[PDB]
Design a protein around this nucleic acid. Structure first.
Ligand SMILES: Cc1cn([C@H]2C[C@H](O)[C@@H](COP(=O)(O)OP(=O)(O)OP(=O)(O)O)O2)c(=O)[nH]c1=O
Ligand SMILES: [Ca+2]
Ligand SMILES: [Ca+2]
Ligand SMILES: [Ca+2]
Ligand SMILES: [Ca+2]
Ligand SMILES: [Ca+2]
Ligand SMILES: [Ca+2]
Ligand code: NA
Ligand code: NA
Length: 902
DNA sequence: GCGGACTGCTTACC
């Protein structure tokens, strides 16, 4: 096989590289890299290098890397540009690996670990590291083993060895329910004392030095605590053994009171899974405890234990260790589903960066573009200092707040990247400019054709139609990867519905789940068998179909993020190719493209459906149009339909065979208008919404911009077994909205759209009645908690103190001085509850860390003074009033003169 | 007292 790097670092005039050789062995080489930078030279001076603009450049080799840096600084003083890749690690990887990297992940040592630190002094600050580490579970992906380091003797209690026999038993058997599939992969190691533990961990660390280091909050807690604990005990020199190059860097962001440190272990790529999750999951959770996320992602039970964590080791050391092992495994399970590690490796080796740089799309694109330009023997420009400037973006149509029975939406495939490719927008493809007419002139085609020679954007920019651009070239390749993975995803979704249909007629028999590749559509042979299988087989297949879809989702939605982030990078002053001319060219073209096709779609419908002058497009956001399909249905009449599935098939056929061609013609013309390089405005049909046939449901409604709900039957080819609700922006979709209210509001909407007003009022009356019996957690609001100290004036709310921040200050007073009572962490999210007047807490509300039960110290008191009617009004009533008034409905039966009867 | 205009904060949707 071909060789591939693992981690690269720059230390002085040396580059430290860990890599896998052509035989598969992990090695480490120190290279005194001689980097080359460039400078402009006379046109006379013959050369092989030219900048992206065609200006000749002379290559300049350097004795070492510090020399290349001192030269960059000297060129600045002179006021001349120093071209080339300034980040020498990237240039080295580019040189050393001048080919597409095919990596073997089984050769990459990915390490998952978690530590336990017992502390009566509240949360054990990693900077201080004053409490003994009493447990470490460390999973190694090469060995496929869980290495457990267990401290039996501590100043905070002496315990017996942990039993793997008891750990394997069910909770109900007094066991700990460690998953049986890892029982044989656990390697247990007890220790007489902490020094022996920590020293044995260090030697284990060296024999199996992790390349990728992940876990839950390992960067924020585990890593800095282990580093600082070892430093306090064995001195810094030993604490540096965590780095394979013995070099670490302690970045200080102490954050007011206390000390927060950002420890960087050179030679190791740390990918904290909480950071991978926040960037790549595309969810917003009310809590980010591993327990909460595990339950959300895996549908597993919450790791239950009796007392506080600070006493779990002494009271139940057996469970203490078991939960530490399980926690490590939980992250592995989440990754097996989400596959963020795999995505990071993909993006990492594709771009040729340090793996941990996948968090930075700008670094990612800097490397991709640089490597692309390096092959054509081209020299990249120098990064410049730019001032930030506010510039506009997408167009959002203001909707008329109302109900909408039949709705059909259309969306443009990868809008902004397509625009980049269509117009050939790139730093080096700029041809010139032109005098612009107001945007509506181009939209209405009243303006004059900008150019007959170049590709144009209505922001005034012109680009070459015949030259290939680095940005369009590289964005196209990643986009092609995205289209591939989305196809796999959607096929699994289509197969997902197929299983859900067969689950209506399960076949009582003992069978095994069929061996199919869910990334591809089911064959007729496989389809036929599906309707002849049991429930044990079908439900297992539904699981695998969804795991395939999730794997496809991760792959497609994050390559989508990467390419959209390239557009965004063009508007960031830290990007090497920052250029508002290009950034605006994208957005302004985008604004034109949308409102152009709004007019074109209106015209095609007004005549072909008779009534001319009526607005069919009711809403639009950036690149979508929501078409009112009432008149389309009425032109045939609803009577000519067998069932709901019939007219859904009808519109599906109507949009596919009639609408889309007209839209294509509209974008063919616009492409010609702007004289673009290639037509790539592909608007396919999105959703098909409407009430079930012959029902009293309203189908859908809008309350305003980015706030609507639709009863959808088909979405991008996928025909749902049961109609799925498409809700955007409404309170049901916000993490700040309490769980029970999310359900209640959603059920209100479902009835609103599917069943009608009468059903809504029936469910409303019932919910209001039983509302007060809901668990307090499920009806607590959620909010991020920033700048707490900023609003903390002597334990009391300062001026303009936010509601939730007020709730926190109330909480701090209620648990004053009482250590071991959980503290609210600056930046994390909190649950919020209103309090009735005259409560002993002395404030409008209270707040405590989300994902947790409020401390027993005050829990019983809080449950009493909960203001239910306030919760009902603010969180449930008020948003529901918004929905109903907009759709012109009532959640409560109004008073009539008929009320005078019995 | 209390609603309307404004601002800070949070969280959604492209
Ligand atoms: C979601 C999102 C969109 N956008 C911009 C660029 C997108 O082209 C435009 C529309 O995004 P979307 O229409 O939501 O998705 P997409 O068009 O990019 O690709 P597809 O629809 O096939 O899934 O909005 C961003 O800049 N950043 C984002 O995070
Ligand atoms: Ca723990
Ligand atoms: Ca159980
Ligand atoms: Ca000993
Ligand atoms: Ca789109
Ligand atoms: Ca869209
Ligand atoms: Ca099409
Ligand atoms: Na972090
Ligand atoms: Na069947």
């Amino acid at each position: 096989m071909k060789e591939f790097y693992l981690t690269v670092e720059q230390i002085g005039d040396s580059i430290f590289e860990r890599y896998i050789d052509s035989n598969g062995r992990e090695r480490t080489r120190e290279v005194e890299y001689k980097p080359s930078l460039f400078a402009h030279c006379p046109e006379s001076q013959a050369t092989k290098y030219f900048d992206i603009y065609g200006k000749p450049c002379t290559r300049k080799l350097f004795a070492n890397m510090r020399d290349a840096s001192q030269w960059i600084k000297r060129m600045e003083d002179i006021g001349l540009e120093a071209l080339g890749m300034d980040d020498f690690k990237l240039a080295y990887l580019s040189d050393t690996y001048n080919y597409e990297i095919k990596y073997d992940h089984t050769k990459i040592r990915v390490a998952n670990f978690d530590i336990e630190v017992t502390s009566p002094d509240g949360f054990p600050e990693p900077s201080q590291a004053k409490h003994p580490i009493d447990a470490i579970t460390h999973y190694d992906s090469i060995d496929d083993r869980f290495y457990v380091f267990d401290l039996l003797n501590s100043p905070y209690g002496n315990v017996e060895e942990w039993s793997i026999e008891i750990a394997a038993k069910l909770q109900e058997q007094g066991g700990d329910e460690v998953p049986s599939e890892i029982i044989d992969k656990i390697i247990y190691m007890p220790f007489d004392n902490e020094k022996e533990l920590l020293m044995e961990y260090l030697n284990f660390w060296q024999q199996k030095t992790p390349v990728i280091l992940t876990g839950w909050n390992v960067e924020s807690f585990a890593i800095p605590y282990v580093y600082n604990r070892i430093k306090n005990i064995f001195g810094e020199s030993t604490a540096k053994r965590l780095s394979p190059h013995r070099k670490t860097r302690v970045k200080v962001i102490e954050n007011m009171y206390g000390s927060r440190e950002i420890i960087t272990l050179f030679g190791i790529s740390v990918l904290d899974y909480i950071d991978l999750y926040k960037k790549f999951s595309f969810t917003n959770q009310p809590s980010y405890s591993l327990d909460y996320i595990s339950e959300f992602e895996l549908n597993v039970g919450k790791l239950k234990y009796d007392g506080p964590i600070s006493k779990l080791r002494e009271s139940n050391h057996q469970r203490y260790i078991s939960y530490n092992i399980i926690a490590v495994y939980r992250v592995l399970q989440i990754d097996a589903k989400r596959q963020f590690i795999n995505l990071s490796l993909d993006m990492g080796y594709y771009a040729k960066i340090q793996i941990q740089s996948v968090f930075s799309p700008i670094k990612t694109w800097d490397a991709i573009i640089f490597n692309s330009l390096k092959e054509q023997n081209k020299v990249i420009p120098q990064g410049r200092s730019h001032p930030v400037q506010p510039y506009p973006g997408a167009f959002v149509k203001e909707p008329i707040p109302n109900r909408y029975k039949y709705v059909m939406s259309f969306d443009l495939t990868s809008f902004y990247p397509s625009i980049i490719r269509q117009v050939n927008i790139s730093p080096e493809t700029i041809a010139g400019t032109f005098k612009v007419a107001p945007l509506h002139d181009y939209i209405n085609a009243v303006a004059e054709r900008p150019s007959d020679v170049y590709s144009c954007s209505p922001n005034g920019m012109m680009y070459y139609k015949d030259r290939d651009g680095v940005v369009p070239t590289e964005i196209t390749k990643v986009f092609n990867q995205r289209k591939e993975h989305k196809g796999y995803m959607l096929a699994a979704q289509r197969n997902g519905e197929i299983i859900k249909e067969a689950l209506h007629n399960p076949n009582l028999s003992v069978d095994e789940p069929l061996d199919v590749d869910y990334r591809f559509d089911f064959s007729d042979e496989i389809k036929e068998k599906i309707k002849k299988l049991s429930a044990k087989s079908l439900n297992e297949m539904l699981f695998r179909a969804q795991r395939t879809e999730v794997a496809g989702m991760t792959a497609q939605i994050n390559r989508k993020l990467l390419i959209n982030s390239l557009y965004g990078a063009l508007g960031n002053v830290w990007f090497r190719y920052y250029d508002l001319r290009n950034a605006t060219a994208i957005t302004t073209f985008g604004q034109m493209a949308l409102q152009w096709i709004e007019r074109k779609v209106n015209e095609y419908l007004n005549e072909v459906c008779g009534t001319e002058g009526e607005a069919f497009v009711l809403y639009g956001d950036t690149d979508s149009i929501y078409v009112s399909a009432d008149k389309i249905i009425d032109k045939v009449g609803e009577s000519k339909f067998r069932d709901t599935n019939h007219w859904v098939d009808f519109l599906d056929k109507f949009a596919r065979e009639r609408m889309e061609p007209a839209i294509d013609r509209g974008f063919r013309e616009m492409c010609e208008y702007m004289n673009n390089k290639q037509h790539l405005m592909f608007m396919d049909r999105e959703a098909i919404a409407g009430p079930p046939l012959g029902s009293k449901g309203i189908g859908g409604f809008w309350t305003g911009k980015k706030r609507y709900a639709l009863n959808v039957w088909d979405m991008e080819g996928t025909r749902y077994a049961e109609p799925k609700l498409k809700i955007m922006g409404l309170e049901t979709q916000k993490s700040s909205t309490p769980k029970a209210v999310q359900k209640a509001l959603k059920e209100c909407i479902r009835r609103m759209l599917q069943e009608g007003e009468e059903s809504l009022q029936e469910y409303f009356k019932e919910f209001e009645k039983e509302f007060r019996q809901l668990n307090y957690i499920s009806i607590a609001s959620v909010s991020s908690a920033n700048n707490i100290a900023k609003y903390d004036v002597g334990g009391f709310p300062g001026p303009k103190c936010p509601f939730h921040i007020r709730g926190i200050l109330t909480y701090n007073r209620a648990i004053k001085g009482n250590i071991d009572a959980p503290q609210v962490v600056e930046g994390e999210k909190v649950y919020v509850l209103p309090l009735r007047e005259g409560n002993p807490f002395g404030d409008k509300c209270i707040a405590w860390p989300s994902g947790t039960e409020i401390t027993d110290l005050i829990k019983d008191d809080v449950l009493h003074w909960m203001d239910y009617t306030v919760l009902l009004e603010k969180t449930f009533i008020k948003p529901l009033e918004g929905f109903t008034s907009a759709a012109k409905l009532d959640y409560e039966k109004k008073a009539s003169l008929f009320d005078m009867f019995d």
